[PDB]
Structure 1
Amino acid sequence: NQALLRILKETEFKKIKVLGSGAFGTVYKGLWIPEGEKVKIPVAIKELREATSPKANKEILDEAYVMASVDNPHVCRLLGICLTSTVQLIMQLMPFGCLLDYVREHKDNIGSQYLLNWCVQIAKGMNYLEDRRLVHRDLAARNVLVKTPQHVKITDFGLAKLVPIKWMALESILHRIYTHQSDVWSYGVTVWELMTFGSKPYDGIPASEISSILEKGERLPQPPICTIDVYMIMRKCWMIDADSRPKFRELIIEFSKMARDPQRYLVIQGDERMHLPSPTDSNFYRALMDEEDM
């Protein structure tokens, strides 16, 4: 149970470079130095921006014992925690960054086979969080990490204790109701982010007014690379009836169907010039960075 969350000493890790921030904390590239060893292992460290108390920290250690409990290839597991005056969370390092920045930076080189596979993988991790009765509350392309280009993982889960209005389902904005189906709404918006190559949803619409335009029946438009088959699925994620939104287990299957013939469903200029890596190149990544089961 508590055998998955390691409590760390200040003296056995070091923060070396600022990699990004969030809403409750800044993320650093770090180094883990085990006691009595001469190795320095790269980690990812999240320092909480607001300073907590000694009892605030029993609350943290309760979601930190759960966050360290996720055992899923497409969800990032909390590994360790360091209980300072600003609690520091230790996790595995992803040098490729988040999927949001990656798609902006590689948009001219991303084919349909990658994108559809990511959506399969994202929904697999989220279906796991549903299987684990864990509602994420902040699924977005920025909180999806890229282990290798062929393998993504979801991160930043544990923020109810601690607002991305443009990703939240209508009932969250109106009533603060967060369920697995409102994570489906967040998922459909994340798929939009991928399919538009990192565009900002509702760009120029103030967040204070989005709950209104949603109630009038307005949604995000069809991404130019998307066929209607893909967009209808996204549209089904944004239904005002939460129960009518698709389930993650169904989002997995359908996007699996689309990944077996990717060029029918996403029309990208030059899509014939970019394919998945040969089994040679897939094994090369996996032996070097990505040895887990799937």
Structure 2
Amino acid sequence: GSWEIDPKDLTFLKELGTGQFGVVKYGKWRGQYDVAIKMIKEGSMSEDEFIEEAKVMMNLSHEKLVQLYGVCTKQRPIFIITEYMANGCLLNYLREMRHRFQTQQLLEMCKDVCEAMEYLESKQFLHRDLAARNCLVNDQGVVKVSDFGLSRYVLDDEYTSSVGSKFPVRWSPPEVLMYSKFSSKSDIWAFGVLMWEIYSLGKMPYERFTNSETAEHIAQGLRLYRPHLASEKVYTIMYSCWHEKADERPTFKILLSNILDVMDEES
């Protein structure tokens, strides 16, 4: 099928990482094209459901989304083939103090993510785990959104629900923590936290709190506060993502307009 890549077309060149979901390698497709090859650990994913969804995911083409090129499903482990992003994970990139980022660079990263999310919003597609650890950085410093929708197919019980140890509590609005109500507005909340991660150079949100303490904090109506590098206008944008009432939170189209306005003011 159009979603199926011949694994014989891959040349494996370097290891990019190993973890719970499997092993990621850098390689070439048909000798010429850079790819990331994700080798899925058996039992970690609902593979048939993922393969069906891969057909939809591949039609999601936007310059700020990490592209899904196809899957290799005729051997074990299956492979997922994606765009290669030379500078790796955004969270680690933010934490490398050598870059000495300007705030204009940080705002540009927020805009890259927002553009990807406005596109997903326009397609009624939820990310469901938006956070700096799920964004990647290419050789030009462009940030792109990765692993969109993947959490629906992860089998690990600690990651599946608000009670689990791996659940992204610190990126979740009160209605997710209390009621499991996911919507565009839970992606909005997570985006505001991602903006906070960017302007905090990769600090853990609510860094002094446990997950349980964070959930209590949020339930009481309290919030993150302003990163030192965020201007008042930037803080207003991120804070708007955290209204207790989900329907009072902006859309990604509004956030993008807000971010572009601040870019103009701060250039």
Report TM bin, short chain.
0.7 to 0.9
Show the counterpart of 2:161: none
Rg bigger for which structure?
1
Letter in 2 for 1:17: K
Distance (whole Å) between structure 2 residues aligned to residue 109 and residue 63 of structure 1: 39
The residue that corresponds to 1:89 in the other structure is 80
Q: Which letter does structure 1 place at the counterpart of 2:201?
A: F
| Partner residue in 1 for 2:158 | none
Letter in 1 for 2:187: D
1:245 aligns with 2:249: yes
1:130 to 115, 118, 121: 121
| Alpha-carbon contact 1:141-1:193 (below 8 Å) kept | yes
Once the two structures are TM-superposed, the CA of residue 106 in structure 1 deviates from its matched residue by 4.3
1:160 partner SS: helix
Q: Quote the sequence identity (%).
A: 33
- Which secondary structure does the structure 1 equivalent of 2:70 belong to? strand
Q: Quick one: which of 29, 34, 47 aligns to 2:26?
A: 29
Tell me the distance in 2 between the aligned counterparts of 1:174 and 1:247: 22
- In the alignment, what sits opposite 1:290? none
- State which of 200, 203, 206 in structure 2 corresponds to 1:196: 200
- List, as ranges, runs of 4+ consecutive aligned residues in structure 1 with deviation greater than 6 Å: none
Look up the match of 2:10.
13
1:63 aligned residue: 53
- Which piece of structure 1 moves more, 108-117 or 188-197? 108-117
1:51 to 36, 39, 43: 43
Distance 1:182 1:107, change over 3 A: farther
TM-score by length of 1: 0.79
Query: What SS does the aligned partner of 1:260 have?
Result: helix
In terms of mean alpha carbon deviation, does 179-188 or 56-65 score higher? 56-65
Q: Take 2:255 and 2:249, find their aligned partners in 1: how far apart are those partners? A: 10
Structure 1 unaligned spans of 5+:
264-294
Paired position in structure 1 for 2:163: none
Q: How far is 1:127 from its partner?
A: 0.7
Q: CA deviation at 1:185?
A: 0.6
- State the distance in 1 between where 2:18 and 2:251 align: 31
Matching residue of 1:267: none
Q: Does 1:172 align with 2:176?
A: yes
Q: Determine the structure 1 residue equivalent to 2:218.
A: 214
Which SS does the other structure have where 1:136 is aligned? Answer: coil
Equivalent residue, structure 2, for 1:283: none
Residue 28 of structure 1, CA deviation: 2.1
SS of the residue aligned with 1:44?
strand
Across the aligned residues of Structure 1 and Structure 2, the Cα RMSD in angstroms comes to 2.2
Aligned residues: 253
Amino acid corresponding to residue 42 of structure 1 in structure 2: D
Deviation, structure 1 residue 250: 0.7
User: Residue in 2 aligned with 1:160?
Assistant: 152
Q: Matched residues in 2 for 1:10 and 1:45: separation?
A: 10
Distance 1:238 1:24, change over 3 A: farther
